[PDB]
Design a protein around this ligand. Structure first.
Ligand code: GSP
Ligand code: FME
Ligand code: MG
Ligand code: MG
Ligand code: MG
Ligand code: MG
Ligand code: MG
Ligand code: MG
Ligand code: MG
Ligand code: MG
Ligand code: MG
Ligand code: MG
Ligand code: MG
Ligand code: MG
Ligand code: MG
Ligand code: MG
Ligand code: MG
Ligand code: MG
Ligand code: MG
Ligand code: MG
Ligand code: MG
Ligand code: MG
Ligand code: MG
Ligand code: MG
Ligand code: MG
Ligand code: MG
Ligand code: MG
Ligand code: MG
Ligand code: MG
Ligand code: MG
Ligand code: MG
Ligand code: MG
Ligand code: MG
Ligand code: MG
Ligand code: MG
Ligand code: MG
Ligand code: MG
Ligand code: MG
Ligand code: MG
Ligand code: MG
Ligand code: MG
Ligand code: MG
Ligand code: MG
Ligand code: MG
Ligand code: MG
Ligand code: MG
Ligand code: MG
Ligand code: MG
Ligand code: NA
Lengths: 571, 69, 117
RNA sequence: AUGACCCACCAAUCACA
RNA sequence: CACGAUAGCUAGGACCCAAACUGGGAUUAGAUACCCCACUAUGCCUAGCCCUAAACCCAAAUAGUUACAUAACAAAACUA
RNA sequence: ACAGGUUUGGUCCUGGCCUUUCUAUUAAUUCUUAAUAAAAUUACACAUGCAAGUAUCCGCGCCCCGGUGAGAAUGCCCUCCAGAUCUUAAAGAUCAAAAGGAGCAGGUAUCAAGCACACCUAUAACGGUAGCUCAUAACGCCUUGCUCAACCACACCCCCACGGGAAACAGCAGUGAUAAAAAUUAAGCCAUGAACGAAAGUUUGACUAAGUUAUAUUAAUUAGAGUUGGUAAAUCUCGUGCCAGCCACCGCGGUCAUACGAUUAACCCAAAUUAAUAGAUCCACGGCGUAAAGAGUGUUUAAGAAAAAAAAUCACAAU
């Protein structure tokens, strides 16, 4: 009687042969650590970002517009090298026409180059092999070509279509030939775009600026994006106030393949989301509403399964408790409910019950969505739940704010900032509330610190190592203060006995007792440490303990072993 | 309380005012874990002594009750 | 409220509702808000022509000249209104705008017989 | 010296055309 | 402002008899109670405090009326 | 209030709680189009743009409009007006600081005393009396814009702003944070107003006309929500079995549930409907033997009543 109309933005059908226009190439630059992606970029763009980058690392995807001498417009994507960012690279592979695979000469094909190969191969993207560091001493293009032949990438030398251009990034050796290689492959793909239709696009990175609010870096797939359009991405929407370019410039129009910063989002889009333009505000809200309703339905269903099980267990406990206990009438059920009378079930509603089990409550706040996702994948990797428990209470974009402090304060959390800030006020506030805010610009420092945190909470490993052993000989009954005290006369054989240490009693191989002496006394003197061959009188605090003539006694001491994290992150 | 019995599902919440309080979850069945944010409202539950708040079903992390499937 | 300076004035307050304007002719301090506090209400002017094609103006003449006599100042549109009524000579600007209007009608007449050709 | 708890009054017909 | 039962406090004096407390005896499952015996603080006098009572006739003071008029019970109902 | 439900085995009385009405915010669920009105979490921090100019040089304008409710029991109403400004010789007139007071003015008396808070002399000082406020609430503490053609206050903070923190949207838009709370980084000076100009005129995020939003009305193009034990309009068949759950209040669920959950039927509102929270309204010109309440006693003070007619006084156990 009421079926919800399906209204959501659907990516338009493929453009007609008539309106298809010459496009511009989008090129990802991928590969293993320190092989020179960013130095390539820098040299093309006449800029230095390899100098200014924090830690000399590329931690963020970025798009860059480059015009060449020939009039070639290329959009470059800079992908990070570390194993942590594998999510990012994947996204880069989806939005690209061409990839440039960078492999240094002195090293050759390695793990991240393999991963990159896999992403580009799975996304069905044309790839161009660029060997780097040919100005080096050990530079060997040939080795690299062989190792590439291993992974089913065929170089131009072997007849394969994959183009191999050896290049030195520092000296600018073959740069013209890589440029012309990309040019040729691009002219070969015959790339087309629809300028006239509405805007289909894709989100690179979404972050929050204090001045400009919510902002997204997005590469237009097709359509002209003009100021004042209405965009919809995933579960959130925007009207477009500014569309700006990375040097700060305000650009009035966006044409397909151009990277564009966008302003005016109501909520932050998930990085890697496809952007569809619509006709009005109310249309956009119809859409967002639909999508939310949909997700809530799916989640509701899974929840419905878990629930049904829980209440079927309860239902079974009820049927058991009722039928098994001999139904007659309900009042006689009340009376026959007295056959199982004492009911021992212990349940406490307090929140300090898990602290000794050593949970770790953790709040992540990163600079951009991509980064946050990276960190949460790293946390997904966590394999040891018997050791500690890694509990992510909250994650989000933007600098550390008052809400995050409070949140951490209730859960005894730790706030991990990443490429973000914490103002004075926030800091002193977390000082009052007993929260620690640890800020990190470098992702593996962050994960290190996570490990440090997990291990510091980890249960100290208790090891029992022996101190002394003494055999009982005679048993005495001594009267002191109107109390008969059993006294074990002992002869210390190997080792020594000390008063403060923990003791255990041994009967013919069995262990009878565990605990500490009440009185160790030797020849009318109380002596803390009896050496070897020394006779010592021993009175335990436990009166139930029987001392025979032939018993053995082992004095032991407990030393603490500090365990590190059982969790080793893959990266 | 005494005259009439069941076992009622409640949670403990911390509220934006910083005050921590027991609160009750309407409907049959629910999925709520620690760290979920909910929105609570003022109706007092008559059976439960002490429990003056109620989770709003259908907002944030408390979803509407799923019809039997 | 206490102001630094400014004079008594006869102006139009704008009452009305969107697209349907109405005016209360008013003697007010100069520095106070348009629709705000006033010293005395003087008249009303309804710009929209009514059922009979009349714009209704009301002027409390006695009080108007009492205030002019205390040296209140007139707004250009109140001036235009009084003048129209005949309680003041025509305001020069009414006359001039009339003339300009005539010359526009003339040049559109000629342009009409020039385009018709 | 004692003797779980719980128990009660809030709905109207038949017959004929 | 000046008083205010019993109990209670301070100091000095009294002491027949009564008596919290306590100690004995019964009783009882128990009996730190009721019942029996002893005995003390205290009840008395002088001086000073203390300011409490079911200090309740559970019905405010001062003038009046017996008209209108029954929630119940009680000591009838009411005016200023 | 025209009232209603609920104390008990029952009746009466007393006494609370709740229902029924009306509005606003928020939320849930639903949502077709117009018009009009209104637009509101934050005296926390603010990217960018704009919000004050005119004019033959001087000058004159430049929190005035607009913003906000932070502070303060502020204050309402009313005396009296220095000053500024306009006009004109003057006289007038508009806005009215300071100073005042017939009266009225948030809670709290478990805030009961304040501690110099008065007056004279006269010359403006010397000097002299020993006062002044307060149970008709002084002196404190808490909360707070308002009695609305409007008024009062603030203008980053240190009541103030020389200085010092430090580098200011509580102008329009925007944005972070924060909150249950979400309007355009828009167009024009065409009309009114304001500034300036002798003037044509220029400027003005005041404002005008628009944009956005079920917040409210209305109009039709629009059907969905809540409820059906009683109060209180309206129910049937299954499932469950003191479980799962429901309720504003009484209460419902223990195998024949009109009260849960779903179905059938119905009722009631309707582009809305429920829920939550704040209001509007609501207590005593009523009572005090037994229900909450006559303060253990008398005298006076302050304050009141006198409203017509008279009186003080004799066995007995005051102290
Ligand atoms: N000798 C030599 N050194 C080079 C060459 N290209 C880059 N390098 C050096 O390698 C280092 C890393 O370069 P970089 O641009 O950061 O590589 P990357 O792939 O972007 O590194 P990452 O972002 O994955 S961590 C730099 O210090 C640079 O000087 C080259 O062609 N020859
Ligand atoms: C105690 O004094 C000890 C006697 C134990 S031998 C049975 N001798 C010396 O210390
Ligand atoms: Mg790099
Ligand atoms: Mg928003
Ligand atoms: Mg029950
Ligand atoms: Mg409720
Ligand atoms: Mg929702
Ligand atoms: Mg209007
Ligand atoms: Mg017993
Ligand atoms: Mg009984
Ligand atoms: Mg006495
Ligand atoms: Mg005495
Ligand atoms: Mg004595
Ligand atoms: Mg005696
Ligand atoms: Mg005796
Ligand atoms: Mg005895
Ligand atoms: Mg005497
Ligand atoms: Mg008496
Ligand atoms: Mg009494
Ligand atoms: Mg009296
Ligand atoms: Mg009763
Ligand atoms: Mg009953
Ligand atoms: Mg009642
Ligand atoms: Mg809303
Ligand atoms: Mg104002
Ligand atoms: Mg104050
Ligand atoms: Mg004057
Ligand atoms: Mg004044
Ligand atoms: Mg305030
Ligand atoms: Mg101030
Ligand atoms: Mg400010
Ligand atoms: Mg100031
Ligand atoms: Mg603003
Ligand atoms: Mg300002
Ligand atoms: Mg915001
Ligand atoms: Mg609102
Ligand atoms: Mg929004
Ligand atoms: Mg104008
Ligand atoms: Mg003009
Ligand atoms: Mg403008
Ligand atoms: Mg219900
Ligand atoms: Mg049934
Ligand atoms: Mg009901
Ligand atoms: Mg039902
Ligand atoms: Mg409505
Ligand atoms: Mg009484
Ligand atoms: Mg009395
Ligand atoms: Mg008394
Ligand atoms: Na580097």
């Amino acid at each position: 009687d009421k079926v919800r109309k399906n209204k959501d933005a659907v990516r338009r059908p493929q453009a007609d042969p008539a309106l298809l226009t010459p496009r511009s190439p989008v090129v990802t630059i991928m590969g293993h650590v320190d092989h020179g992606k960013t130095t390539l970029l820098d040299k093309f763009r006449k800029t230095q970002v390899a100098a200014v980058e924090t830690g000399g690392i590329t931690q963020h995807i970025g798009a860059f517009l480059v015009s060449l001498p020939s009039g070639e417009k290329i959009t470059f994507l800079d992908t990070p090298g570390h194993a942590a960012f594998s999510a990012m690279r994947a996204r880069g592979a989806q939005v690209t026409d061409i990839v440039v695979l960078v492999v240094a000469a002195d090293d050759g094909v390695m793990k991240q180059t393999v991963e990159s190969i896999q992403h580009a191969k799975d996304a069905q993207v044309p790839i161009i092999l660029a060997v780097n560091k040919c100005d080096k001493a050990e530079a060997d293009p040939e080795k690299v070509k062989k190792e590439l032949l291993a992974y089913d990438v065929v170089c131009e030398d072997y007849g394969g279509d994959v183009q191999a251009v050896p290049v030195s990034a520092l000296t600018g050796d073959n740069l013209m030939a890589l440029a012309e290689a990309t040019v040729a492959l691009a002219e070969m793909l015959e790339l087309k775009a629809d300028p006239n239709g509405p805007v289909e696009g894709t989100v690179i990175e979404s972050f929050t600026d204090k001045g400009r609010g919510l902002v997204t870096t997005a590469i237009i797939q097709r359509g002209t994006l003009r100021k004042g359009s209405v965009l919809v991405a995933g579960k959130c929407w925007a009207k477009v106030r500014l569309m700006f370019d990375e040097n700060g410039k305000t650009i009035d129009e966006a044409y397909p393949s151009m990277p564009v910063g966008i302003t005016g989002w109501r909520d932050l889009p998930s990085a890697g989301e496809e952007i569809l333009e619509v006709e009005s505000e109310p249309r956009a809200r119809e859409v967002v509403d639909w999508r939310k309703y949909e997700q809530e339905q799916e989640k509701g269903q899974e929840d419905l399964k878990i629930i049904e099980e829980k209440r079927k267990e309860h239902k079974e406990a009820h049927q058991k408790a009722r039928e098994k206990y001999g139904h007659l009438l309900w009042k006689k059920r009340s009376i026959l409910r007295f056959l199982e009378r004492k009911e021992q079930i212990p349940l406490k509603p307090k929140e300090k019950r898990e602290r000794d089990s050593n949970v770790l409550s953790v709040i992540i706040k990163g600079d951009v969505d991509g980064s946050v996702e990276a960190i949460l994948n790293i946390i997904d990797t966590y394999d040891a739940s018997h050791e500690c428990e890694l509990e992510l209470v909250h994650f989000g974009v933007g600098d550390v704010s008052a809400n995050d402090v409070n949140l951490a304060e209730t859960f005894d959390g730790v706030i991990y900032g990443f490429n973000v800030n914490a103002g004075n006020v926030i800091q002193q506030s977390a000082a009052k509330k007993g929260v620690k805010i640890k800020l990190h610009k470098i992702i593996y420092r962050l994960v290190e610190d996570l490990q440090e945190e997990l291990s510091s909470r980890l249960p100290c490993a208790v090891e029992e190592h022996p101190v002394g052993e003494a055999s009982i000989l005679a048993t005495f009954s001594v009267t002191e203060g109107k109390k008969k005290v059993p006294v074990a006369g002992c002869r210390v054989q190997k080792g020594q006995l000390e008063k403060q240490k923990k003791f255990k009693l041994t009967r013919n191989g069995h262990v009878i007792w565990k605990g500490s002496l009440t009185s160790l006394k030797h020849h009318k003197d109380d002596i803390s440490i009896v050496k070897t061959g020394m006779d010592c009188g021993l009175s335990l605090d436990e009166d139930n303990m029987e001392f025979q003539v032939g018993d053995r006694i082992v004095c032991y001491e407990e030393k603490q072993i500090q365990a590190k994290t059982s969790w080793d992150p893959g990266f | 309380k005494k005259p009439n019995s069941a076992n009622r599902k409640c949670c403990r919440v911390r509220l934006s005012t910083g005050r921590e309080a027991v609160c009750f979850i309407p409907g049959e069945g629910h999925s709520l874990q620690e760290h979920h944010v909910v929105l609570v409202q003022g109706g007092r539950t008559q059976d439960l002594p002490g429990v003056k708040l109620t989770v709003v079903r259908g907002k944030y992390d408390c979803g509407h009750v799923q019809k039997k499937k | 409220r206490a102001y630094r300076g400014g004079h008594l004035t006869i102006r139009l307050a704008l009452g009305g509702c969107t697209n349907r304007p109405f005016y209360r002719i008013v003697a007010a301090h100069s520095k106070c808000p348009r629709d705000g506090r006033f010293v005395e209400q003087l008249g009303s002017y309804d710009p929209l022509p009514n059922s009979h094609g009349e714009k209704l103006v009301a002027l409390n003449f006695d009080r108007i000249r009492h205030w002019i006599g205390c040296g209140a100042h007139l707004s250009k549109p109140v001036e235009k209104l009084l003048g129209l009524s005949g309680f003041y000579p025509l305001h020069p600007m009414m006359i001039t705008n009339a003339e300009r209007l005539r010359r526009k009608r003339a040049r559109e007449v000629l342009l009409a017989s020039q385009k018709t050709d």
